[PDB]
Write a protein that binds this ligand. Structure first.
Ligand code: RZJ
Ligand code: RZJ
Lengths: 304, 304
Protein backbone atom coordinates (compact mmCIF):
# COMPACT_ATOMS: atom_id res chain seq x y z
CA UNK A 1 0.00 0.00 0.00
CA UNK A 2 0.92 3.71 -0.26
CA UNK A 3 1.03 5.87 -3.41
CA UNK A 4 4.08 7.84 -4.64
CA UNK A 5 5.00 9.99 -7.68
CA UNK A 6 7.29 7.17 -8.88
CA UNK A 7 9.87 7.47 -11.69
CA UNK A 8 11.17 4.59 -13.88
CA UNK A 9 14.55 3.22 -12.71
CA UNK A 10 17.01 5.45 -14.67
CA UNK A 11 19.98 3.04 -15.09
CA UNK A 12 19.33 2.24 -18.81
CA UNK A 13 19.38 6.04 -19.54
CA UNK A 14 22.33 6.83 -17.23
CA UNK A 15 24.38 4.60 -19.61
CA UNK A 16 23.36 6.84 -22.58
CA UNK A 17 24.17 10.35 -21.23
CA UNK A 18 27.23 12.22 -22.65
CA UNK A 19 28.64 15.77 -22.49
CA UNK A 20 28.50 17.74 -25.78
CA UNK A 21 30.62 20.92 -26.13
CA UNK A 22 30.55 23.20 -29.21
CA UNK A 23 32.68 26.37 -28.85
CA UNK A 24 32.14 27.54 -25.22
CA UNK A 25 28.66 25.94 -24.75
CA UNK A 26 28.36 22.50 -22.99
CA UNK A 27 25.12 20.48 -22.57
CA UNK A 28 23.89 16.87 -22.47
CA UNK A 29 23.55 14.41 -25.37
CA UNK A 30 22.00 10.96 -25.76
CA UNK A 31 24.35 8.29 -27.14
CA UNK A 32 22.37 5.41 -28.73
CA UNK A 33 24.21 3.07 -31.15
CA UNK A 34 26.77 5.33 -33.02
CA UNK A 35 24.66 8.56 -32.86
CA UNK A 36 24.75 11.31 -30.20
CA UNK A 37 21.53 13.41 -30.07
CA UNK A 38 21.60 16.89 -28.46
CA UNK A 39 19.77 20.26 -28.72
CA UNK A 40 20.98 22.16 -31.83
CA UNK A 41 21.27 25.39 -29.73
CA UNK A 42 24.66 23.81 -28.65
CA UNK A 43 26.13 25.60 -31.77
CA UNK A 44 24.82 29.04 -30.58
CA UNK A 45 26.72 31.84 -28.80
CA UNK A 46 24.56 33.93 -26.34
CA UNK A 47 24.41 36.64 -29.14
CA UNK A 48 23.17 34.06 -31.76
CA UNK A 49 20.45 32.93 -29.23
CA UNK A 50 18.25 36.04 -29.94
CA UNK A 51 17.61 35.32 -33.71
CA UNK A 52 19.75 32.29 -34.71
CA UNK A 53 20.01 31.06 -38.33
CA UNK A 54 20.80 27.43 -37.36
CA UNK A 55 21.56 26.49 -41.01
CA UNK A 56 24.11 29.37 -41.40
CA UNK A 57 25.56 28.69 -37.90
CA UNK A 58 25.95 24.91 -38.50
CA UNK A 59 27.79 25.61 -41.85
CA UNK A 60 30.64 27.18 -39.79
CA UNK A 61 31.01 23.87 -37.83
CA UNK A 62 33.02 20.71 -38.68
CA UNK A 63 32.89 17.18 -37.15
CA UNK A 64 35.99 18.11 -34.99
CA UNK A 65 34.28 21.27 -33.50
CA UNK A 66 31.84 18.86 -31.69
CA UNK A 67 33.56 17.52 -28.52
CA UNK A 68 31.62 14.45 -27.29
CA UNK A 69 32.81 13.00 -23.96
CA UNK A 70 31.32 9.83 -22.39
CA UNK A 71 32.29 9.81 -18.70
CA UNK A 72 36.03 10.56 -19.13
CA UNK A 73 36.57 8.99 -22.66
CA UNK A 74 36.26 11.17 -25.83
CA UNK A 75 34.16 10.01 -28.83
CA UNK A 76 35.35 10.58 -32.43
CA UNK A 77 32.70 12.47 -34.51
CA UNK A 78 32.63 11.27 -38.18
CA UNK A 79 29.33 12.94 -39.21
CA UNK A 80 26.89 15.68 -38.17
CA UNK A 81 23.38 16.60 -39.30
CA UNK A 82 20.48 18.72 -38.12
CA UNK A 83 17.01 17.10 -37.92
CA UNK A 84 14.46 19.78 -36.89
CA UNK A 85 15.86 21.19 -33.57
CA UNK A 86 18.26 18.28 -32.70
CA UNK A 87 21.82 17.66 -33.93
CA UNK A 88 22.72 14.02 -34.67
CA UNK A 89 26.48 13.44 -34.21
CA UNK A 90 27.66 10.25 -35.92
CA UNK A 91 30.45 8.77 -33.68
CA UNK A 92 32.72 5.84 -34.74
CA UNK A 93 31.77 3.72 -31.61
CA UNK A 94 28.32 2.16 -30.87
CA UNK A 95 27.43 2.89 -27.21
CA UNK A 96 27.96 -0.59 -25.61
CA UNK A 97 25.30 0.39 -22.99
CA UNK A 98 22.59 1.07 -25.68
CA UNK A 99 19.32 -0.37 -24.29
CA UNK A 100 16.51 -1.61 -26.57
CA UNK A 101 14.82 1.74 -27.28
CA UNK A 102 12.35 3.65 -29.47
CA UNK A 103 11.63 7.32 -30.18
CA UNK A 104 7.96 8.12 -29.36
CA UNK A 105 6.10 11.43 -29.54
CA UNK A 106 3.82 11.37 -26.43
CA UNK A 107 0.33 12.90 -26.19
CA UNK A 108 -0.45 15.71 -23.74
CA UNK A 109 -1.64 14.21 -20.39
CA UNK A 110 0.79 11.22 -20.76
CA UNK A 111 3.54 10.90 -18.09
CA UNK A 112 7.28 10.15 -18.28
CA UNK A 113 10.47 10.10 -16.16
CA UNK A 114 13.15 12.89 -16.54
CA UNK A 115 16.82 12.15 -15.82
CA UNK A 116 18.11 15.72 -15.14
CA UNK A 117 21.84 15.86 -16.12
CA UNK A 118 24.72 18.42 -15.99
CA UNK A 119 27.88 17.98 -18.16
CA UNK A 120 26.64 14.52 -19.28
CA UNK A 121 26.32 13.48 -15.56
CA UNK A 122 22.95 12.37 -14.08
CA UNK A 123 21.89 14.39 -10.97
CA UNK A 124 18.32 13.14 -10.35
CA UNK A 125 15.11 11.51 -11.58
CA UNK A 126 11.46 12.63 -11.22
CA UNK A 127 8.08 11.81 -12.88
CA UNK A 128 6.46 14.49 -15.14
CA UNK A 129 3.37 15.01 -17.33
CA UNK A 130 3.26 16.68 -20.73
CA UNK A 131 0.81 19.51 -19.79
CA UNK A 132 -2.19 19.90 -22.19
CA UNK A 133 -0.38 23.11 -23.35
CA UNK A 134 2.78 21.01 -24.24
CA UNK A 135 4.96 22.41 -21.40
CA UNK A 136 6.40 20.41 -18.47
CA UNK A 137 6.84 21.65 -14.89
CA UNK A 138 10.43 20.45 -14.44
CA UNK A 139 13.52 21.17 -12.35
CA UNK A 140 16.18 22.33 -14.87
CA UNK A 141 19.24 24.65 -14.39
CA UNK A 142 21.84 25.92 -16.94
CA UNK A 143 23.57 22.84 -18.51
CA UNK A 144 20.39 20.62 -18.03
CA UNK A 145 19.53 21.01 -21.79
CA UNK A 146 19.75 17.62 -23.58
CA UNK A 147 18.33 15.88 -20.45
CA UNK A 148 15.72 13.35 -21.74
CA UNK A 149 12.24 12.12 -20.72
CA UNK A 150 11.43 8.42 -21.14
CA UNK A 151 9.17 5.46 -20.29
CA UNK A 152 10.34 1.82 -19.84
CA UNK A 153 8.27 -1.20 -21.12
CA UNK A 154 10.11 -4.19 -19.51
CA UNK A 155 13.51 -3.95 -21.32
CA UNK A 156 12.66 -1.20 -23.90
CA UNK A 157 13.24 2.57 -23.19
CA UNK A 158 10.81 4.81 -25.14
CA UNK A 159 12.50 8.25 -25.33
CA UNK A 160 9.79 10.93 -25.63
CA UNK A 161 11.41 14.24 -24.53
CA UNK A 162 14.63 16.24 -24.87
CA UNK A 163 14.91 19.38 -22.70
CA UNK A 164 15.58 22.60 -24.70
CA UNK A 165 14.56 25.71 -22.67
CA UNK A 166 12.79 27.37 -19.74
CA UNK A 167 10.13 29.97 -20.74
CA UNK A 168 10.16 33.32 -18.86
CA UNK A 169 7.31 31.79 -16.71
CA UNK A 170 9.73 29.04 -15.44
CA UNK A 171 7.95 26.12 -17.23
CA UNK A 172 9.96 23.90 -19.57
CA UNK A 173 9.75 23.33 -23.36
CA UNK A 174 11.47 20.63 -25.41
CA UNK A 175 11.29 18.24 -28.35
CA UNK A 176 10.77 14.57 -29.17
CA UNK A 177 13.99 12.77 -30.25
CA UNK A 178 13.28 13.74 -33.91
CA UNK A 179 13.68 17.34 -32.60
CA UNK A 180 10.09 18.49 -33.21
CA UNK A 181 8.94 20.81 -30.39
CA UNK A 182 6.02 19.82 -28.20
CA UNK A 183 3.71 22.85 -28.60
CA UNK A 184 4.35 26.07 -30.57
CA UNK A 185 7.82 26.72 -29.02
CA UNK A 186 10.87 27.67 -31.18
CA UNK A 187 14.56 27.32 -30.04
CA UNK A 188 15.09 31.14 -29.94
CA UNK A 189 15.53 33.48 -26.90
CA UNK A 190 12.24 35.44 -27.39
CA UNK A 191 9.06 35.91 -25.27
CA UNK A 192 6.97 32.75 -25.86
CA UNK A 193 3.70 32.19 -23.96
CA UNK A 194 2.18 28.72 -23.32
CA UNK A 195 -1.59 28.35 -23.74
CA UNK A 196 -4.01 28.05 -20.82
CA UNK A 197 -2.80 24.97 -18.86
CA UNK A 198 -5.84 22.68 -18.24
CA UNK A 199 -6.06 19.87 -15.65
CA UNK A 200 -5.80 16.30 -17.04
CA UNK A 201 -9.27 15.05 -15.97
CA UNK A 202 -8.70 11.33 -16.80
CA UNK A 203 -5.49 11.42 -14.65
CA UNK A 204 -7.27 13.04 -11.66
CA UNK A 205 -9.98 10.30 -11.88
CA UNK A 206 -7.22 7.62 -12.10
CA UNK A 207 -5.70 9.13 -8.91
CA UNK A 208 -9.12 9.11 -7.16
CA UNK A 209 -9.20 5.34 -8.02
CA UNK A 210 -5.61 5.00 -6.57
CA UNK A 211 -6.90 6.78 -3.40
CA UNK A 212 -9.94 4.48 -2.92
CA UNK A 213 -7.65 1.42 -3.50
CA UNK A 214 -5.28 2.76 -0.75
CA UNK A 215 -8.11 3.41 1.80
CA UNK A 216 -8.66 7.21 1.28
CA UNK A 217 -12.43 7.13 0.48
CA UNK A 218 -13.85 10.18 2.39
CA UNK A 219 -14.58 12.02 -0.93
CA UNK A 220 -16.85 9.13 -2.23
CA UNK A 221 -20.42 10.59 -2.26
CA UNK A 222 -24.04 9.38 -2.86
CA UNK A 223 -24.32 11.24 -6.24
CA UNK A 224 -23.74 10.25 -9.85
CA UNK A 225 -23.74 12.38 -13.07
CA UNK A 226 -23.56 12.31 -16.91
CA UNK A 227 -20.58 12.97 -19.29
CA UNK A 228 -22.35 16.18 -20.50
CA UNK A 229 -23.14 17.33 -16.88
CA UNK A 230 -19.59 16.46 -15.67
CA UNK A 231 -18.06 18.31 -18.72
CA UNK A 232 -20.18 21.44 -17.90
CA UNK A 233 -18.30 21.48 -14.52
CA UNK A 234 -14.94 20.49 -16.19
CA UNK A 235 -15.32 23.56 -18.52
CA UNK A 236 -15.87 25.93 -15.53
CA UNK A 237 -12.70 24.63 -13.68
CA UNK A 238 -10.34 24.45 -16.75
CA UNK A 239 -10.39 20.63 -16.65
CA UNK A 240 -9.91 18.76 -20.00
CA UNK A 241 -13.25 17.50 -21.43
CA UNK A 242 -13.88 13.81 -20.48
CA UNK A 243 -14.66 11.57 -23.56
CA UNK A 244 -15.74 7.87 -23.79
CA UNK A 245 -12.05 7.04 -24.68
CA UNK A 246 -11.07 8.32 -21.16
CA UNK A 247 -13.98 6.32 -19.54
CA UNK A 248 -12.78 3.18 -21.46
CA UNK A 249 -9.17 3.67 -20.24
CA UNK A 250 -10.56 3.89 -16.63
CA UNK A 251 -12.47 0.56 -17.00
CA UNK A 252 -9.84 -1.67 -15.28
CA UNK A 253 -9.88 0.68 -12.19
CA UNK A 254 -13.69 0.91 -12.36
CA UNK A 255 -13.72 -2.96 -12.39
CA UNK A 256 -11.23 -3.48 -9.50
CA UNK A 257 -12.89 -0.83 -7.26
CA UNK A 258 -16.47 -1.62 -8.40
CA UNK A 259 -17.00 2.21 -8.65
CA UNK A 260 -18.59 3.27 -11.99
CA UNK A 261 -16.59 6.01 -13.80
CA UNK A 262 -19.59 8.42 -13.81
CA UNK A 263 -20.03 8.01 -9.98
CA UNK A 264 -16.30 8.90 -9.55
CA UNK A 265 -16.95 11.88 -11.96
CA UNK A 266 -19.71 12.95 -9.43
CA UNK A 267 -17.17 12.63 -6.56
CA UNK A 268 -14.78 14.86 -8.61
CA UNK A 269 -17.61 17.34 -9.42
CA UNK A 270 -18.37 17.79 -5.68
CA UNK A 271 -14.58 18.19 -4.97
CA UNK A 272 -14.33 20.92 -7.67
CA UNK A 273 -17.50 22.81 -6.50
CA UNK A 274 -16.74 22.40 -2.75
CA UNK A 275 -12.90 22.04 -2.51
CA UNK A 276 -11.21 19.64 -0.03
CA UNK A 277 -12.37 21.49 3.20
CA UNK A 278 -8.79 21.25 4.63
CA UNK A 279 -8.79 17.41 4.14
CA UNK A 280 -6.12 15.54 2.09
CA UNK A 281 -6.18 12.67 -0.47
CA UNK A 282 -3.03 10.47 -0.63
CA UNK A 283 -1.25 13.20 1.43
CA UNK A 284 -2.26 15.93 -1.09
CA UNK A 285 -4.38 19.07 -0.49
CA UNK A 286 -5.18 19.42 -4.25
CA UNK A 287 -6.31 17.16 -7.12
CA UNK A 288 -3.21 15.41 -8.61
CA UNK A 289 -3.21 14.97 -12.44
CA UNK A 290 0.33 13.56 -13.20
CA UNK A 291 -0.75 9.86 -12.83
CA UNK A 292 -2.25 8.19 -15.96
CA UNK A 293 -4.73 5.33 -15.54
CA UNK A 294 -1.79 3.12 -16.74
CA UNK A 295 0.47 4.56 -13.94
CA UNK A 296 -2.18 3.74 -11.25
CA UNK A 297 -2.62 0.12 -12.57
CA UNK A 298 1.21 -0.35 -12.80
CA UNK A 299 1.88 1.07 -9.28
CA UNK A 300 -1.18 -0.59 -7.64
CA UNK A 301 -0.38 -4.10 -9.27
CA UNK A 302 3.50 -4.14 -9.16
CA UNK A 303 4.70 -4.11 -12.85
CA UNK A 304 8.58 -4.37 -13.11
CA UNK B 1 14.14 26.83 -12.24
CA UNK B 2 11.30 24.61 -10.94
CA UNK B 3 11.35 22.32 -7.88
CA UNK B 4 10.61 18.56 -7.90
CA UNK B 5 10.65 15.68 -5.38
CA UNK B 6 13.77 14.31 -7.12
CA UNK B 7 15.28 10.83 -6.52
CA UNK B 8 18.96 9.86 -7.03
CA UNK B 9 19.61 8.12 -10.37
CA UNK B 10 19.04 4.42 -9.44
CA UNK B 11 21.42 2.69 -11.92
CA UNK B 12 24.17 1.86 -9.34
CA UNK B 13 21.48 0.10 -7.19
CA UNK B 14 19.68 -1.58 -10.11
CA UNK B 15 22.98 -3.49 -10.63
CA UNK B 16 22.79 -4.79 -7.01
CA UNK B 17 19.19 -6.15 -6.85
CA UNK B 18 18.65 -9.96 -6.79
CA UNK B 19 15.74 -12.34 -6.14
CA UNK B 20 16.01 -14.42 -2.92
CA UNK B 21 13.73 -17.47 -2.48
CA UNK B 22 13.62 -19.61 0.69
CA UNK B 23 10.94 -22.35 0.63
CA UNK B 24 7.88 -20.74 -1.04
CA UNK B 25 8.72 -17.09 -0.08
CA UNK B 26 10.51 -14.81 -2.65
CA UNK B 27 11.73 -11.23 -1.98
CA UNK B 28 14.56 -8.86 -2.95
CA UNK B 29 18.21 -8.96 -1.84
CA UNK B 30 21.17 -6.60 -2.21
CA UNK B 31 24.28 -8.15 -3.79
CA UNK B 32 27.43 -6.19 -2.84
CA UNK B 33 30.84 -7.90 -3.26
CA UNK B 34 30.20 -11.65 -2.43
CA UNK B 35 27.35 -11.04 0.10
CA UNK B 36 23.58 -10.94 -0.58
CA UNK B 37 21.61 -9.02 2.11
CA UNK B 38 17.84 -9.64 2.50
CA UNK B 39 15.13 -9.50 5.22
CA UNK B 40 15.42 -12.57 7.52
CA UNK B 41 11.60 -13.06 7.34
CA UNK B 42 12.46 -14.77 3.95
CA UNK B 43 12.87 -18.01 6.05
CA UNK B 44 9.31 -17.68 7.51
CA UNK B 45 6.10 -19.47 6.43
CA UNK B 46 2.86 -17.38 6.90
CA UNK B 47 2.24 -19.50 10.12
CA UNK B 48 5.78 -18.69 11.50
CA UNK B 49 5.10 -14.94 10.80
CA UNK B 50 2.83 -14.59 13.93
CA UNK B 51 5.55 -15.47 16.58
CA UNK B 52 8.72 -16.55 14.70
CA UNK B 53 11.82 -17.92 16.50
CA UNK B 54 14.27 -16.81 13.77
CA UNK B 55 17.17 -18.70 15.44
CA UNK B 56 15.19 -22.01 15.53
CA UNK B 57 13.82 -21.40 11.98
CA UNK B 58 17.28 -20.60 10.49
CA UNK B 59 18.73 -23.84 12.06
CA UNK B 60 16.43 -25.84 9.70
CA UNK B 61 18.03 -24.06 6.67
CA UNK B 62 21.21 -24.92 4.71
CA UNK B 63 23.22 -22.83 2.16
CA UNK B 64 21.40 -24.76 -0.69
CA UNK B 65 17.86 -23.85 0.66
CA UNK B 66 18.66 -20.18 -0.26
CA UNK B 67 18.03 -19.69 -4.02
CA UNK B 68 19.73 -16.43 -5.12
CA UNK B 69 19.08 -15.39 -8.74
CA UNK B 70 20.69 -12.31 -10.38
CA UNK B 71 18.65 -11.46 -13.49
CA UNK B 72 18.50 -14.99 -15.00
CA UNK B 73 21.83 -16.42 -13.56
CA UNK B 74 21.84 -18.37 -10.24
CA UNK B 75 24.40 -17.56 -7.48
CA UNK B 76 26.05 -20.34 -5.43
CA UNK B 77 25.55 -19.78 -1.64
CA UNK B 78 28.63 -20.91 0.39
CA UNK B 79 27.67 -19.28 3.74
CA UNK B 80 24.69 -17.83 5.64
CA UNK B 81 24.38 -15.80 8.84
CA UNK B 82 21.81 -13.68 10.62
CA UNK B 83 22.83 -10.16 11.75
CA UNK B 84 19.90 -8.61 13.69
CA UNK B 85 16.92 -8.79 11.22
CA UNK B 86 18.94 -9.30 7.96
CA UNK B 87 20.36 -12.53 6.50
CA UNK B 88 23.81 -12.26 4.88
CA UNK B 89 24.24 -14.92 2.14
CA UNK B 90 27.89 -15.47 1.23
CA UNK B 91 27.97 -16.22 -2.56
CA UNK B 92 31.10 -17.46 -4.43
CA UNK B 93 30.99 -14.52 -6.99
CA UNK B 94 31.65 -10.80 -6.21
CA UNK B 95 28.90 -8.73 -7.90
CA UNK B 96 30.87 -7.17 -10.85
CA UNK B 97 28.41 -4.19 -10.70
CA UNK B 98 29.25 -3.42 -6.99
CA UNK B 99 29.44 0.40 -6.71
CA UNK B 100 31.60 2.14 -4.08
CA UNK B 101 29.17 1.99 -1.14
CA UNK B 102 28.72 2.33 2.63
CA UNK B 103 26.09 1.26 5.16
CA UNK B 104 24.76 4.33 7.05
CA UNK B 105 22.05 4.55 9.71
CA UNK B 106 20.19 7.82 8.84
CA UNK B 107 18.60 10.22 11.35
CA UNK B 108 14.86 10.92 11.36
CA UNK B 109 14.09 13.92 9.06
CA UNK B 110 16.89 12.87 6.60
CA UNK B 111 15.78 11.91 3.04
CA UNK B 112 16.71 9.05 0.70
CA UNK B 113 15.72 7.40 -2.61
CA UNK B 114 13.81 4.01 -2.65
CA UNK B 115 14.21 1.60 -5.58
CA UNK B 116 10.97 -0.46 -5.20
CA UNK B 117 11.63 -3.99 -6.60
CA UNK B 118 9.63 -7.24 -7.20
CA UNK B 119 11.41 -10.62 -7.71
CA UNK B 120 14.81 -8.83 -7.76
CA UNK B 121 13.51 -6.54 -10.61
CA UNK B 122 13.38 -2.72 -10.19
CA UNK B 123 9.89 -1.21 -10.83
CA UNK B 124 10.35 2.44 -9.77
CA UNK B 125 12.21 5.12 -7.80
CA UNK B 126 10.88 7.85 -5.46
CA UNK B 127 12.31 10.18 -2.75
CA UNK B 128 11.32 9.52 0.93
CA UNK B 129 11.97 10.89 4.43
CA UNK B 130 12.55 8.86 7.58
CA UNK B 131 9.55 10.24 9.59
CA UNK B 132 10.45 11.48 13.14
CA UNK B 133 8.59 8.31 14.33
CA UNK B 134 10.99 6.10 12.20
CA UNK B 135 8.34 5.06 9.61
CA UNK B 136 8.38 5.92 5.88
CA UNK B 137 5.34 6.69 3.71
CA UNK B 138 6.27 4.40 0.82
CA UNK B 139 4.66 2.53 -2.08
CA UNK B 140 5.30 -1.18 -1.36
CA UNK B 141 3.31 -4.33 -2.41
CA UNK B 142 3.87 -8.05 -1.58
CA UNK B 143 7.39 -9.03 -2.84
CA UNK B 144 8.75 -5.40 -2.34
CA UNK B 145 10.54 -6.51 0.92
CA UNK B 146 14.34 -6.23 0.52
CA UNK B 147 13.90 -3.05 -1.59
CA UNK B 148 16.56 -0.56 -0.33
CA UNK B 149 16.78 3.18 0.41
CA UNK B 150 20.01 5.02 -0.47
CA UNK B 151 21.80 8.33 -1.08
CA UNK B 152 24.59 8.91 -3.67
CA UNK B 153 27.67 11.15 -2.94
CA UNK B 154 29.31 11.46 -6.43
CA UNK B 155 30.34 7.78 -7.02
CA UNK B 156 29.52 6.33 -3.54
CA UNK B 157 26.07 4.78 -2.69
CA UNK B 158 25.21 5.08 1.04
CA UNK B 159 22.60 2.35 1.73
CA UNK B 160 20.43 3.46 4.67
CA UNK B 161 17.18 1.40 4.45
CA UNK B 162 15.93 -2.11 3.73
CA UNK B 163 12.13 -2.54 3.47
CA UNK B 164 10.68 -5.15 5.89
CA UNK B 165 6.91 -4.56 6.45
CA UNK B 166 3.78 -2.42 6.18
CA UNK B 167 2.07 -1.64 9.55
CA UNK B 168 -1.74 -2.07 9.72
CA UNK B 169 -1.88 1.78 9.19
CA UNK B 170 -0.22 1.38 5.71
CA UNK B 171 3.09 3.10 6.67
CA UNK B 172 6.36 1.24 6.15
CA UNK B 173 8.98 -0.06 8.63
CA UNK B 174 12.46 -1.38 7.87
CA UNK B 175 16.09 -1.66 8.93
CA UNK B 176 19.53 -0.26 8.17
CA UNK B 177 21.81 -2.70 6.27
CA UNK B 178 23.06 -4.10 9.63
CA UNK B 179 19.40 -5.17 10.10
CA UNK B 180 18.60 -2.93 13.09
CA UNK B 181 15.03 -1.58 12.82
CA UNK B 182 14.42 2.14 12.55
CA UNK B 183 12.04 2.74 15.49
CA UNK B 184 10.56 0.15 17.90
CA UNK B 185 9.34 -2.23 15.15
CA UNK B 186 9.98 -6.03 15.31
CA UNK B 187 9.81 -8.41 12.25
CA UNK B 188 6.67 -10.21 13.57
CA UNK B 189 3.03 -10.07 12.26
CA UNK B 190 1.53 -8.32 15.35
CA UNK B 191 -0.25 -4.95 15.92
CA UNK B 192 2.56 -2.35 16.12
CA UNK B 193 1.74 1.37 16.43
CA UNK B 194 4.12 4.17 15.33
CA UNK B 195 4.45 7.21 17.61
CA UNK B 196 2.89 10.59 16.85
CA UNK B 197 4.36 11.60 13.44
CA UNK B 198 5.71 15.20 13.74
CA UNK B 199 6.50 17.56 10.83
CA UNK B 200 10.24 18.04 10.06
CA UNK B 201 10.44 21.81 10.75
CA UNK B 202 14.00 22.34 9.35
CA UNK B 203 12.87 20.63 6.07
CA UNK B 204 9.74 22.83 5.74
CA UNK B 205 11.95 25.95 6.23
CA UNK B 206 14.43 24.58 3.61
CA UNK B 207 11.45 24.19 1.21
CA UNK B 208 10.27 27.77 1.96
CA UNK B 209 13.84 28.84 0.92
CA UNK B 210 13.49 26.67 -2.28
CA UNK B 211 10.15 28.48 -2.94
CA UNK B 212 11.58 32.02 -2.54
CA UNK B 213 14.55 31.02 -4.82
CA UNK B 214 12.01 29.80 -7.48
CA UNK B 215 9.85 33.01 -7.33
CA UNK B 216 7.01 31.83 -4.97
CA UNK B 217 7.33 34.59 -2.29
CA UNK B 218 3.66 35.48 -1.44
CA UNK B 219 4.02 33.93 2.08
CA UNK B 220 6.99 36.27 3.00
CA UNK B 221 5.61 38.65 5.71
CA UNK B 222 6.74 41.79 7.66
CA UNK B 223 7.13 39.83 10.97
CA UNK B 224 10.05 38.11 12.69
CA UNK B 225 10.15 35.91 15.85
CA UNK B 226 12.42 34.08 18.37
CA UNK B 227 13.40 30.35 18.60
CA UNK B 228 11.37 30.08 21.87
CA UNK B 229 8.32 31.91 20.34
CA UNK B 230 8.54 29.87 17.08
CA UNK B 231 8.86 26.58 19.13
CA UNK B 232 5.71 27.53 21.16
CA UNK B 233 3.85 27.48 17.78
CA UNK B 234 5.80 24.35 16.57
CA UNK B 235 4.61 22.51 19.75
CA UNK B 236 0.92 23.41 19.05
CA UNK B 237 1.11 22.11 15.38
CA UNK B 238 3.15 18.89 16.07
CA UNK B 239 6.21 20.37 14.34
CA UNK B 240 9.69 19.19 15.54
CA UNK B 241 11.35 21.75 17.89
CA UNK B 242 13.79 24.03 15.95
CA UNK B 243 17.33 24.14 17.53
CA UNK B 244 20.43 26.27 16.67
CA UNK B 245 21.82 23.17 14.80
CA UNK B 246 18.82 23.46 12.38
CA UNK B 247 19.37 27.28 12.04
CA UNK B 248 23.10 26.60 11.29
CA UNK B 249 22.20 24.01 8.59
CA UNK B 250 19.88 26.67 7.00
CA UNK B 251 22.71 29.29 6.87
CA UNK B 252 23.69 28.72 3.19
CA UNK B 253 20.00 29.26 2.13
CA UNK B 254 19.70 32.22 4.53
CA UNK B 255 22.88 33.65 2.85
CA UNK B 256 21.79 33.08 -0.80
CA UNK B 257 18.24 34.46 -0.22
CA UNK B 258 19.34 37.17 2.27
CA UNK B 259 16.31 36.09 4.44
CA UNK B 260 17.28 35.53 8.12
CA UNK B 261 16.18 32.08 9.45
CA UNK B 262 14.05 33.64 12.24
CA UNK B 263 12.17 35.85 9.67
CA UNK B 264 11.41 32.67 7.63
CA UNK B 265 10.31 31.03 10.98
CA UNK B 266 7.83 34.02 11.29
CA UNK B 267 6.59 33.33 7.72
CA UNK B 268 6.07 29.65 8.75
CA UNK B 269 4.35 30.70 12.03
CA UNK B 270 1.79 32.81 10.08
CA UNK B 271 1.28 29.88 7.60
CA UNK B 272 0.61 27.48 10.53
CA UNK B 273 -1.78 29.89 12.37
CA UNK B 274 -3.55 31.08 9.17
CA UNK B 275 -3.18 28.18 6.65
CA UNK B 276 -2.55 28.78 2.90
CA UNK B 277 -5.97 30.48 2.16
CA UNK B 278 -6.39 28.28 -0.98
CA UNK B 279 -2.97 29.47 -2.34
CA UNK B 280 -0.12 27.06 -3.29
CA UNK B 281 3.69 27.03 -2.76
CA UNK B 282 5.76 25.19 -5.43
CA UNK B 283 2.45 23.65 -6.66
CA UNK B 284 1.61 22.35 -3.13
CA UNK B 285 -1.43 23.21 -0.94
CA UNK B 286 0.39 22.05 2.26
CA UNK B 287 3.82 22.55 3.89
CA UNK B 288 6.28 19.99 2.36
CA UNK B 289 8.84 18.45 4.82
CA UNK B 290 10.62 15.74 2.68
CA UNK B 291 13.38 18.14 1.41
CA UNK B 292 16.44 18.59 3.68
CA UNK B 293 18.41 21.86 3.55
CA UNK B 294 21.07 19.73 1.71
CA UNK B 295 18.42 18.60 -0.87
CA UNK B 296 17.40 22.26 -1.58
CA UNK B 297 21.09 23.36 -2.01
CA UNK B 298 21.82 20.30 -4.26
CA UNK B 299 18.68 20.79 -6.45
CA UNK B 300 18.93 24.62 -6.56
CA UNK B 301 22.77 24.54 -7.44
CA UNK B 302 22.96 21.43 -9.76
CA UNK B 303 25.12 18.80 -7.90
CA UNK B 304 25.71 15.61 -10.05
C1 RZJ C 1 19.13 30.66 -24.15
N1 RZJ C 1 18.15 30.01 -25.00
C2 RZJ C 1 18.51 28.73 -25.55
C3 RZJ C 1 17.47 28.01 -26.37
C4 RZJ C 1 16.32 28.87 -26.87
C5 RZJ C 1 15.80 29.82 -25.75
C6 RZJ C 1 14.42 30.12 -25.65
C7 RZJ C 1 13.97 30.96 -24.64
C8 RZJ C 1 14.91 31.50 -23.73
S1 RZJ C 1 14.39 32.60 -22.41
N2 RZJ C 1 12.75 33.05 -22.63
O1 RZJ C 1 14.65 32.00 -21.10
O2 RZJ C 1 15.31 33.75 -22.40
C9 RZJ C 1 16.27 31.21 -23.83
C10 RZJ C 1 16.73 30.35 -24.85
C1 RZJ D 1 3.98 -10.77 7.05
N1 RZJ D 1 4.94 -10.11 7.91
C2 RZJ D 1 6.32 -10.17 7.51
C3 RZJ D 1 7.32 -9.42 8.36
C4 RZJ D 1 6.84 -9.02 9.74
C5 RZJ D 1 5.39 -8.45 9.69
C6 RZJ D 1 5.01 -7.39 10.54
C7 RZJ D 1 3.71 -6.88 10.48
C8 RZJ D 1 2.81 -7.44 9.55
S1 RZJ D 1 1.12 -6.83 9.43
N2 RZJ D 1 0.78 -5.76 10.71
O1 RZJ D 1 0.88 -6.24 8.10
O2 RZJ D 1 0.23 -8.00 9.40
C9 RZJ D 1 3.18 -8.49 8.71
C10 RZJ D 1 4.49 -9.00 8.77
Amino acid sequence: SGFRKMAFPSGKVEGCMVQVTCGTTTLNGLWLDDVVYCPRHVICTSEDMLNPNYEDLLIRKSNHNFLVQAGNVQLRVIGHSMQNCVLKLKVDTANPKTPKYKFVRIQPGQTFSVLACYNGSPSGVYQCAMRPNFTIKGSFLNGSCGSVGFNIDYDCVSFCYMHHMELPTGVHAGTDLEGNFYGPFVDRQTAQAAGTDTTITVNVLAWLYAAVINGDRWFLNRFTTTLNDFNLVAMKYNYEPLTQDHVDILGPLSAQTGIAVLDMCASLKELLQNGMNGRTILGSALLEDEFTPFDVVRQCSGVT
